[PDB]
A paper describes a structure:
Arginines were placed in an i,i + 3 (RxxR) arrangement within a heptad repeat located proximal to the N-terminus. The sequence at the axial interface was conserved in order to maintain the cross-α stacking interactions within a protofilament. The resultant peptide was designated as 29-20-2 using the same (x-y-z) nomenclature described above, with the value of z equal to 2 for the RxxR motif. The 29-20-2 peptide adopted an α-helical conformation in solution and. formed high aspect-ratio tubular filaments. However, the observed widths of the filaments were significantly larger, circa 12 nm, than the corresponding values for peptides in the (x-y-3) series. A 3.8-Å resolution helical reconstruction from the corresponding cryo-EM images afforded an atomic model for the 29-20-2 filament. Unexpectedly, the filament formed a double-walled cross-α nanotube that was similar in structure to that of the Form II filament and a structurally related mutant. Remarkably, the arginine residues in RxxR motif were not involved in the lateral interactions between cross-α helical protofilaments. Instead, cohesive interactions were mediated through hydrogen-bonding between the N- and C-terminal glutamine residues from helices on laterally adjacent protofilaments, as in the Form II-related structures. The structural analysis of the 29-20-2 filament provided evidence that the formation of the arginine clasp interaction required not only the presence of the two arginines, but also the correct orientation, RxxxR, of the corresponding residues within the sequences of the respective helical protomers. The relatively minor substitution of an RxxR motif for an RxxxR motifs drove the lateral association down an alternative pathway that resulted in formation of a double-walled nanotube in which lateral interactions occurred between terminal glutamine residues.
Here we report seven high-resolution cryo-EM structures of filamentous peptide nanotubes based on a cross-α supramolecular architecture that provide insight into the designability of helical peptide filaments. A structural interaction is identified based on an appropriately placed pair of arginine residues (RxxxR) within the corresponding peptide sequences. This local interaction motif, designated as an arginine clasp, is robust within the context of these cross-α assemblies and can guide the coalescence of helical protofilaments into structurally defined cross-α nanotubes. In contrast to most structurally characterized filaments based on synthetic α-helical coiled-coils, the chain axes of the helical protomers are oriented in a plane nearly perpendicular to the long axis of the assembly.
Numbering used by the authors:
A (entry chain tA), B (entry chain jA), C (entry chain ZA), D (entry chain PA), E (entry chain FA), F (entry chain 5), ...: 1101 to 1129
L (entry chain a), M (entry chain f), N (entry chain p), O (entry chain k), P (entry chain u), Q (entry chain 4), ...: 1001 to 1029
Y (entry chain 6), Z (entry chain w), AA (entry chain GA), AB (entry chain m), AC (entry chain QA), AD (entry chain c): 2001 to 2029
AE (entry chain O), AF (entry chain M), AG (entry chain K), AH (entry chain I), AI (entry chain G), AJ (entry chain E), ...: 1 to 29
AR (entry chain HA): 2101 to 2129
AS (entry chain XA), AT (entry chain NA), AU (entry chain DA), AV (entry chain 3), AW (entry chain t), AX (entry chain j), ...: 101 to 129
Write the structure that this text describes.
């Protein structure tokens, strides 16, 4: 099941990356 | 049933990959 | 009934493959 | 009734095969 | 009534065969 | 009434045979 | 009323025979 | 009224006979 | 009124006879 | 599971960054 | 887990900054 | 009593429907 | 009483329908 | 009373329909 | 009793439906 | 008893549906 | 018993649905 | 027993749903 | 036993849902 | 056993939900 | 075992919720 | 084990809540 | 372990509450 | 450890309460 | 007082209803 | 006062209804 | 007093209902 | 005041209705 | 006193109901 | 004021209706 | 102060209630 | 301040209620 | 601020209510 | 910001309501 | 962004409402 | 993106509404 | 993609609406 | 693919609408 | 395939619509 | 197959429409 | 088979339409 | 069989249409 | 049988149509 | 009002007399 | 905002004046 | 926004003036 | 956006001016 | 998008100017 | 797509200019 | 597809130019 | 199919050019 | 079938060329 | 049948060639 938890970690990292990009571009705004 | 769990892991990895690509391209945007 | 579960595993693997191909091509996009 | 379940297994295998072929050709696309 | 169930099994086998042929020819496509 | 059920079994067998022939000829196609 | 049910059985047998002949000739086709 | 039901039985037997003859001749076809 | 019902029985018997003769001659055909 | 906690830390850092950018721009307002 | 607590500290600092900016602008009002 | 004669009329109309459909058959041939 | 004679009229009209359909048959031949 | 004579008229019209249909028969022959 | 004769009428109308559909078949050929 | 004859009528109407659908098939070809 | 014949009618209607859907398929091609 | 035949009817209706959906697929292409 | 066949019917309806959704996909493209 | 097949049906319905949501995605784009 | 497959179904429904919410996002943009 | 997969489902539903709220944000802007 | 993943789910739901309240803020402005 | 993450969740819910009350303030103005 | 006159009107309408029903009777004869 | 005059109008309409029903009676004779 | 006149109106309407039902009887004969 | 004149108009229309029904009576004789 | 007259009206309505049900009986025959 | 004149018009139309019905009467004689 | 204005609104609504009840009186007369 | 403006709106709606009730009075006269 | 503008809208709608009620008055006269 | 524009739209619709009610006034005169 | 454009559309529709109401005014004069 | 284009279409339709209302004005003059 | 093309079609239809309304203007002058 | 071609057809019909409206303009001048 | 050919036919009809509208233009000049 | 030939016929009729519209153009010049 | 021959007839009529339209062209020149 | 011969007749009439249109062409030149 | 002979007559008339059109051709040259 | 009560008492007595006469007649029948 | 309250005072004074004049003239009545 | 409130004050003053003039002239009436 | 609010202020001032002029002239009336 | 808002401001200013001119001339009236 | 928005801005500016010119000339009127 | 959007931009620019020229000449008028 | 889209782009460019030339010459007018 | 699509592309290119030449010559006009 | 489609392709190519030549010569014009 550890694979499922790794997948969750990946999903959350990706979401954090989306949020960070949105933050940076909104700062550019 | 472990095969089902492996399939779930695969699905989530693929979704994470989609999200990562979308994040990178939105950063390129 | 294990055959049914194997069939489910196959279906999910195929769906994951579709998603992975779509992800790769969207990255190419 | 086990024959019915075998038939279901066959149907799902065939559907999985259709999906796999569609996935491969979409990757070729 | 078991004859009815056998008939159902036959019908589903035939449908699975149709689907398998369609899958193979679509792969040939 | 069992005669009615036998007739139903016959009908379904015949339909399955039609479907099997159509499947085989579509495979020949 | 059992005569009516016997008549129904006869009708369905005849229809099944028609279908079987059509199936065989379509296989010959 | 049983005479009416007997008449109905006769009608259906005759129709079944017509259908059987048509089936046999279509098989001869 | 039973006479009316007897007349109906007669009519249906006659119609069945017509149909039976037509069936036999079509079989002769 | 520590990976999950790291992901949470990342998410919260990103949210804090969004909030800080919004604060700075509202100060600019 | 200390990372989570640091993230909380960051969030609260950002909120305090928002509030301070709102206070200053309301004083300007 | 009127309802009884009404039912008789319905019987006769049904027989008329039989004959009319048979005529349509014979014309179609 | 009028309803009774009305029902009689309906009977006679039904018989007329019988005869008319029979005429249409004979014409079609 | 008028309704009663109306019903009588309907009876007679129905008989007229009988005769007219019979005439149409005889003409068709 | 009227209900019984009504049911008989329904039987006959159903047989008429059979014949009419068969005619439509034969026309379609 | 009327319910029994009603059920018979339903059987016959169902057979009519079978034949009519088969006709529609043959027309579509 | 009426319920049993009702169930038979349902079976036949279901078979009719099968045939009608198959016709719709063939038309769509 | 009626419940058993009802269940059979449900099976057949489900198969009809399969075929109808497949037809809708083929039309959409 | 009826419950078992009911469950089978549910399986088949679910497969129908799969196919119908796939059709809706293909139409949307 | 019926519960097991019920659970299988639930699995398949869930997969259908996946596909339907994906279709809605693709339409929204 | 049924509970295990039920849990799997819940997992899949949750993934469906993810996809549906993502679609709603994309529509809102 | 079922409880573990249930917990996983809860995790995924929570992530869905995150995404849905974010969508509501973006719509409100 | 299930309790740990439950706690994680609670964390994520709390973050969702944060985002939803922020959305409500932005709407109110 | 679960208690610790529970406490973290409580912290985050409290922050959510802060934001929600602030929104209610801003609406009231 | 308007209420009283309304009541009188209702009385008269009721008497009219009496006469109308009497006409119905007389016609039915 | 308009209410009173409306009530008078209703009285008169009721009397007219009486006369009309009386005409119905007289015609029916 | 209006209540009393209303009650009288109800009496008369009831008598009218009696006559109307009697007409129903007489017609049914 | 317009309401009062409307009421007068209604009175007159009612009287006209009286006369018209009287004409109906007289013609019926 | 209005209550008493209302009760009388109810008596009469009940008698009317008796007659109406009797008509139902007589028609059913 | 237009309402008042409309009411006058309605009065006059009502009087015209009176005269027209009177003409109907006189012709009927 | 908003409370005071709300109280004034309540006063006015109460006056409206008075006036409307007086209207209902005048209509009832 | 929005509360104050809402209170003003309530005042005006109450005045409207007064005026409309006065209208209903004047109509009723 | 949106709340303030909504309050203004409510003020204006209330004025419209006043004006429309005055219209209804003037019509009623 | 969309909320603000929606509020503006509401303002304008309210003005339209005012103007339309004034139209209805002027027509009523 | 689509929300913003929808808001603009609403603004324009509101202006159209204003203009159309002004038209209706001018016609009414 | 389709949503954005739909929004543009709505903008244009709103402009058309403006223009058509202006037409109706000019006609009314 | 079909959705995108449909959106384009809507754009063009909206332009047509604009142009036609302008035509109606020019005619009205 | 048929959907795509239908979309193209819609595009062309929209262009035709544009052109026809321009024709109507030019005629109106 | 018939669907595809129908789509082609629609394309051609749309082109015809374009051309005919252009004709109508040229005539109008 | 008849459907396919009908589709071909539609193609040809569409071409005829094109050609006829071109004729109408050339005449209009 | 008659359907197929009818389809052929339609093909030929369409060709005739083409040819006749070409004639009309050539005349128009 | 009459249907088949009618279809042949239609074929021949279509050929005649072709030939006559060719005649009209040749005349027009 | 008369139908068959009528069909033959139609065949011959169609041939006559062919021949006459050929005559008209030859005259036109 | 007691006069009204005596009147309806007379009415019911007369109706009872009619019923008794019809009863004695049907007894003589 | 005190100006709004003064306006309300004016409105209520004017309404009171209307009511006082109406009272005076109704006293004169 | 105070300008909007001043505008509302103006509107209400004007409406009060209209009402005062109407009151004065109704007193003159 | 303040420009929009100024425009609204202008619109309301203009409407107030229209109302004031109408009030003045109605006073002159 | 600010350009769109400026355009709206312009439109509303122009409409206000139209209204002001109409008010001025109606004052001149 | 910003080009489309600029085009819309242009259209609205032009419409505002038309309205301003119409306002100016109506002032000259 | 961006070419289509550029074409739309061109069309709207041209329409805006037409409108601007019409506005200029109407100002010259 | 991209060729079709390019063709549409060409058509729209040409139409825009026609419109631009017409605008230029109407400016020259 | 791609040949058909290429033919359509050719047709549309040719039509675009016609339109471009017409635009050029109308510019020369 | 592919031969028929090739023939259609040829026809459309030829028509496109005619149109291209006509466009070229109209450019020469």
């Amino acid at each position: 099941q550890a694979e499922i938890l790794e997948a969750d970690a990946r999903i959350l990292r990706a979401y954090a990356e989306i949020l960070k990009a949105h933050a940076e571009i909104l700062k550019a705004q």
